[PDB]
């Protein structure tokens, strides 16, 4: 038996010996994060993580990954959010994100907390995941902007939200993408991501090299000509940005 790797567009992959039907099912299947090193290894059924133990990919021989399990008993499973449940383990952090970002006071004035890089990385690096409950565009668009600070469009049917009180890390730290502040001159973008625990979500990906302890920012991308459909702080911010443009 040889091994198969199946990559997602975001660079993560499932890897293992497939079964009679070409399915990722068995006790020695892994999800490998985009760093091609951090992995969740163990029991999968048709590509869904049943019990993934944190591991490090130490080498690949004839295409077969050779892992070492990390100490501890960090286990993860597929746990997609619903309309009302953000996570079965809200305080269990993502182990890839934990090595790449931390939350601190923003450097942007009056912006509360922000998301910062722990280490220097290159362009095109996935830094953080934006998981949340999954609600409709109808609910979100029909309600006040004060409730919509953490809403992220996922696709034409779903918006991801991190509603109070899960916007505080003492209550929810499984993912941290909702902590990145806005910039009209950002160093990251939101990008599609298929996560073995969260399912189909978005991630924060660098668009250039970033230094250790640099604040990560993304363009929130509100509609500027539906004036702008956006919160006050952003509209005020948009004026200024437009000012600098000539």
């Amino acid at each position: 038996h040889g091994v198969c790797w199946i990559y997602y567009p975001d660079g993560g992959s499932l890897v293992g010996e497939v079964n009679e039907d070409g399915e990722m099912t068995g006790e020695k299947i892994a999800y490998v994060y985009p760093d091609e090193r951090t992995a969740l290894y163990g029991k999968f059924i048709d590509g869904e993580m049943i019990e993934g133990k944190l591991a490090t990919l130490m080498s690949t021989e004839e295409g077969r990954p050779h892992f070492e399990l990390m100490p501890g008993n960090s286990v993860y499973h597929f746990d997609k959010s619903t309309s009302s449940c953000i996570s079965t383990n809200a305080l269990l952090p993502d182990p890839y994100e934990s090595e790449r970002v931390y939350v601190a006071e923003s450097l942007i004035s009056s912006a509360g907390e922000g998301l910062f890089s722990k280490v220097a990385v290159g362009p095109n690096t996935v830094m953080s995941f934006y998981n949340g409950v999954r609600i409709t565009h109808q609910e979100v668009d029909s309600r006040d902007w004060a409730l919509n600070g953490n809403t992220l469009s996922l696709d034409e049917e779903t918006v991801i939200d991190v509603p109070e009180p899960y916007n505080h890390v003492s209550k929810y730290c499984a993912s941290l993408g909702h902590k990145a502040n806005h910039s009209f001159t950002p160093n990251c973008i939101y990008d599609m991501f298929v996560h073995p625990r969260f399912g189909p979500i978005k991630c924060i990906r660098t668009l250039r090299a970033v230094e250790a302890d640099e604040e990560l920012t993304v363009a929130y991308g509100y509609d500027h000509s539906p004036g702008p459909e956006a919160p006050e702080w952003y509209q005020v911010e948009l004026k200024a940005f437009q000012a600098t443009q000539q």
């Binding site: 565009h137 979100v140 668009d141 919509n148 809403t151 469009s153 034409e156 993304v218 509100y222 509609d223």
Partner: peptide, 8 residues
């Protein structure tokens, strides 16, 4: 439209 990153 009251969410980030839509494809207008």
């Amino acid at each position: 439209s009251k969410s980030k990153d839509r494809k207008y």
